[PDB]
Amino acid sequence: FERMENKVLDMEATSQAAGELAGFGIENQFAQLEASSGVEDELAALKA
Amino acid sequence: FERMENKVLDMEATSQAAGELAGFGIENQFAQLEASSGVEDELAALKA
Amino acid sequence: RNLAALEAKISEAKTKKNMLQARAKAAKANAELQQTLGGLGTSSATSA
Amino acid sequence: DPEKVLEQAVIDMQEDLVQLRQAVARTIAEEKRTEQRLNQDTQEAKKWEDRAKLALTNGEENLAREALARKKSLTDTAAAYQTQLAQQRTMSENLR
Amino acid sequence: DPEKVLEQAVIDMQEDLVQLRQAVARTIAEEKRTEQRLNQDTQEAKKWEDRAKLALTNGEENLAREALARKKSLTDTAAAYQTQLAQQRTMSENLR
């Protein structure tokens, strides 16, 4: 169980490496995606 | 009979070694076990 | 009483480790899925 | 040539989607099992609770308390499995 | 010729960026571990605190104080690890 537990920490360490690099300018494009999402909500209000 | 008697003392000496090491923090967990035992007794009173 | 207590140790010790091992294996499997989703390589076509 | 590289990357994408489907399907299998496991476990405590009710009928408080011991063990497992099921559900949606 | 030197320096730059990525990734791994380490440690003090609560039930003040001894040891480690985690976070951003 200790042996497997170390592997879990390795995955968490990999998650740390995976998570830290995740940050990119793409986050700005998500705001555009959410901005476009409001359009359908605005159109949804038009349907209402 | 003397020969066997010495072996008995060896077992008692082993018991001394076995008994002395028996002490551990697990004794505290027994109090929890007995504490949980009271719950069923309390529930037993509820049934009564 | 020693046998009764010993049986409890064996049952819980066996089952707890197995489920721990199973979930631990599940944990890495989920982590691999997330890593692979980020590790998609079709973006290499930009060179073409 | 970019033509070949772009085509190859497209071909690679075909492999990746299949694997994630398998991972999701694996996730579906895991959540189902714990759901199955936790469901029956919750009942076993009721069964042993009934064994106590027999004890409640006459005498064997020990059996009643013993039944509680199984009850306490089972409910803890259900909570642990319930916690585990939450992780799979979150992970399942993440992959989805 | 400057052409070759300029090209070679460009080629060298390709190596350097990869190494810093590895260093960052190493930094990510280190911070994750201490995060994992400190998180569980904080709980262990609670667990031993519970062992004291058993002592609080009846008698064994020694066990309660003993439990505090583990509590004191663990919290100090968490503070030290918390301090260590701060250094990695600062260092990580520096490299970033």
Q: Tell me the two tokens of residue D86.
A: 């939450």
B26: nearest CA partner in chain E: E51
**Number of residues that this document lists for chain C:** 48
Question: What's phi and psi for D42, nearest 5 deg?
Answer: -55, -35
A12: nearest CA partner in chain C: C31
Angle between helices B26-47 and D61-95 (to 10 degrees): 110
> What does R_g of chain B's alpha carbons equal in angstroms?
20
Contact list, D23 vs chain C (CB under 8 Å): 29-30, 32-33, 36
Whether chains C and E touch (3+ CB pairs under 8 A) is answered by no
DSSP C1-48: -HHHHHHHHHHHHHHHHHHHHHHHHHHHHHHHHHHHHHT--GGGGGG-
DSSP, res E58: S
Q: How far is C27 from chain A, CA to nearest CA, in Å?
A: 8
Angle between helices C2-38 and A2-22 (to 10 degrees): 20
Q: How far apart are CA E56 and CA E63, in angstroms?
A: 9
Q: Is C30 on the interface with D (CB under 8 A)?
A: yes
**Number of residues that this document lists for chain B:** 48
Closest to E85 in 3D by CA, of E11, E33, E10: E33
Contact between D67 and D48 (Cβ < 8 Å): yes
CA distances to D48, D82, E62 from D75, rounded to whole Å, are 12, 10, 32
Q: How far apart are CA E60 and CA B6, in angstroms?
A: 39
Q: How far apart are CA C26 and CA D28, in angstroms?
A: 12
Question: What's phi and psi for D58, nearest 5 deg?
Answer: -165, 115
Handedness of CA C20, C26, C29, C35 (dihedral sign): negative
Q: How far apart are CA B19 and CA B25, in angstroms?
A: 15
Contact list, C28 vs chain A (CB under 8 Å): 7-8, 11
Interface test with C, best of A1, A16, A21 (most C CBs within 10 A): A1
Angle between helices C2-38 and D2-57 (to 10 degrees): 160
How many angstroms is the resolution?
A: 6.6
Residues 6 or more apart whose CB falls under 8 angstroms from that of B39 comprise: D65, D68
Handedness of CA B24, E48, C14, C32 (dihedral sign): negative
Q: Is C40 on the interface with D (CB under 8 A)?
A: yes
CA A12 to chain centre: 17
Largest CA distance in chain D: 87
Q: Tell me the two tokens of residue D65.
A: 């308390």
Q: How far is B38 from chain D, CA to nearest CA, in Å?
A: 8
Q: How far apart are CA E72 and CA E61, in angstroms?
A: 16
The contacts found for E23-27 with CB under 8 angstroms, 24 or more apart, are E23/E95, E24/A17, E24/A20, E24/A21, E24/E92, E24/E95, E24/E96, E25/A17, E25/A20, E25/A21, E27/A20, E27/E88, E27/E91, E27/E92, E27/E95
Residue in E32, E92, E96 closest to A13 by CB: E32
Contact list, D64 vs chain B (CB under 8 Å): 40, 43-44, 47
Q: How far apart are CA D68 and CA D45, in angstroms?
A: 8
Residue in E54, E60, E63 closest to B35 by CB: E54
| SS3 labels along B8-44 | HHHHHHHHHHHHHHHCCCHHHHHHHHHHHHHHHHHHH
Contact list, D26 vs chain C (CB under 8 Å): 29
C39: nearest CA partner in chain A: A18
Q: How far apart are CA D27 and CA A11, in angstroms?
A: 18
Residue in C24, C34, C35 closest to A4 by CB: C24
Q: Is A2 on the interface with C (CB under 8 A)?
A: no
Interface of E with B in 45-84 (CB under 8 A): 51, 54-55, 57-58, 60, 63
**Number of residues that this document lists for chain D:** 96
Q: How far is B26 from chain D, CA to nearest CA, in Å?
A: 18
Q: How far apart are CA B15 and CA A20, in angstroms?
A: 58
The contacts found for E81-85 with CB under 8 angstroms, 24 or more apart, are E81/E34, E81/E37, E81/E38, E81/E41, E82/E38, E84/E34, E85/E31, E85/E34, E85/E35, E85/E38
Residue at token pair 């350097």: E16
Q: How far apart are CA B19 and CA D51, in angstroms?
A: 37
Residue in D64, D67, D72 closest to B36 by CB: D72
Q: How far is A11 from chain C, CA to nearest CA, in Å?
A: 7
CA C40 to chain centre: 23
**Burial of B31 per CB tally in 10 Å (0-12, 13-18, 19+):** middle
